[PDB]
Amino acid sequence: TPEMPVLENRAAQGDITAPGGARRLTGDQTAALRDSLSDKPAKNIILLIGDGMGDSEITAARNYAEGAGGFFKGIDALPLTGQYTHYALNKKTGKPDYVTDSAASATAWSTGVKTYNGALGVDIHEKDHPTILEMAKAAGLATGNVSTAELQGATPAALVAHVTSRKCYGPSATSEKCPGNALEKGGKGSITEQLLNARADVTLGGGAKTFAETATAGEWQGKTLREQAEARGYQLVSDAASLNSVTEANQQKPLLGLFADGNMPVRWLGPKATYHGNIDKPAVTCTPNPQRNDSVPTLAQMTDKAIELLSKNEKGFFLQVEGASIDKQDHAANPCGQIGETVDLDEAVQRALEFAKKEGNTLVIVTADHAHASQIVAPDTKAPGLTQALNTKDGAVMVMSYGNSEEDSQEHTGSQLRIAAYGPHAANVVGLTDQTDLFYTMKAALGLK
Template identity: 35%
Template structure:
């Protein structure tokens, strides 16, 4: 009897252990499936010029070396190589083309291969599949990074043509600065040399077009163009912060039944780093991180959104050497560098962005998840 009771007791323990093991395995499998599943939405946030040292400095500024930013909470991390087709050190145009279409091109070129063939971007392919699309930046909306997702020009300074391309791309949400490139030449502040009134054209096609912070706060509807400055934004009051711009875009795009693609750029990390302005660089990185937090807040609730955070390149060669028991900042350059940039991911499909990847892999892996075609189009521009 004693043996029987012992055997029965052991059998129950083994059974319980097996049950727990099965539950753990199922949870692990469910997590693996969720990490590799295709998301309904993708939010890609690009900190222009943001390297590992920039993130470290921002983290320390929030509460010391043990503090954590919103991007630090994202479970999948890695690094990105950023070289262009003609240089170890990329510029923002070539980097944006690579990130947006999975194709390397020469510095200064937007949305074309070095020999002039058009590329198809993840935004364009998402739009063609029925998803809503948006671009948000603190730069001019015609700047190299947003332009890389929907424009196709031989030079990043061709803002007049980039503006035309952006309107023709039928993007649901455009938020940033750069209004000057959309105004006819006779309007004060216009940078165009022709009579095209692209904002009037956009209104006629159904966009709500606004140009002030007051209008922005009240904006609603399904299509929005908010160009809040003639040039780049100042990122100061009374302009809405990047986090508010991001939340507004998400609120509009999330009404789409088939999902959406949104790119958000924090541009002034780069501007501050070119100037070797450490205080401004840290502030801009923290402002960018607030936009990351806004994206993650939506993704946590939605549970069907992939959030990716990365940079197009590192700017300034920033280092943080010891200064007694503290640190100081040391800049190695006033330009871009060739070092890898960080990448963070959260949500369905995030496992595809772990480890060391190339900037072209970002668009390619989003395309794989969504089963859309991107890359080189065989006709010449």
């Protein structure tokens, strides 16, 4: 049967100065698209999130790492494409809040209800809603949660926690900031305690710092959340070699890999963008980070191990992978750290596509939770914010601009952005959709009742 193609090569076909040379298409696409459509059940879902990776971040990373007529073998290879909205809600009024934070957007694809900036897993009325990871596990599917961020970070956290503030990392912060979720006040716990109660088969990421926190109540009071994880039966891993020796990850032997105290290291370094950086300073070439290490698994390696372990479950699996520091670096106005993290994510999408195209029954979805600050501007721009000129693979210079704040971070933006997919039920990402629809597409694809 024509079992669904990936877009093989969408690079410019020839000499970009010549007629037809910059074309990405060889022929008519109708039949390839016809063969890409299937409403059969999805056995597995792999959802890759570039945090903050709107189309601007994708173009900039492409121009730099692959050239303007280049092609990302992972990211750009998904055949069904759309654009979706991710506006949040204003908690007091219930009216749209046009620019979402990373908690309210993540809660929307994980539970299918809109919420307010800061909420995790609860709606504006502070009522919880089951998440797609809780439902998959209730149906017996294996589940995985992978990020390069600390695991208490808004995006992995939204899959396993229901707190009224993304700040309730562990016991201290929760008692203070989320009293009604505080375990000593009869609540469900902090993000980390809920992480631990949620028991996904594979959880991989950073954030080991909050696991030193000690519980205020419950049958594990006075123990650290790390001790509690061990007692409860998790196999803890802290470096790449131990991750590679893990052969089983399942419900009474769940894997928890904590590879960094905070966020895992970024791939590329570069200077921060500066006022009139393109006019006043030289073009930049990004530097590989000397401290990332063979001891610290890359996102693609974490993805790969996750798929290996999770696919031993006969029933199927749900996996979420997060390319977390695209956002952070965009916030920091650091082009090289932002682009390196988009390159890094592209390798994980490659792994995912590899497995999915071999397996024939996996919906792979690649999107971002919201748009962000960076804009590609003409090389000579005199802009009011932070700018930087970079030397791209084409041997030309590209200038990036961060101009939506005078304060500490550069902000997110509310523009609609790409969602792309491959596999059974991928048709539901084409055209205009809302971020909450992603929930219902994945629930329906998997057939969760």
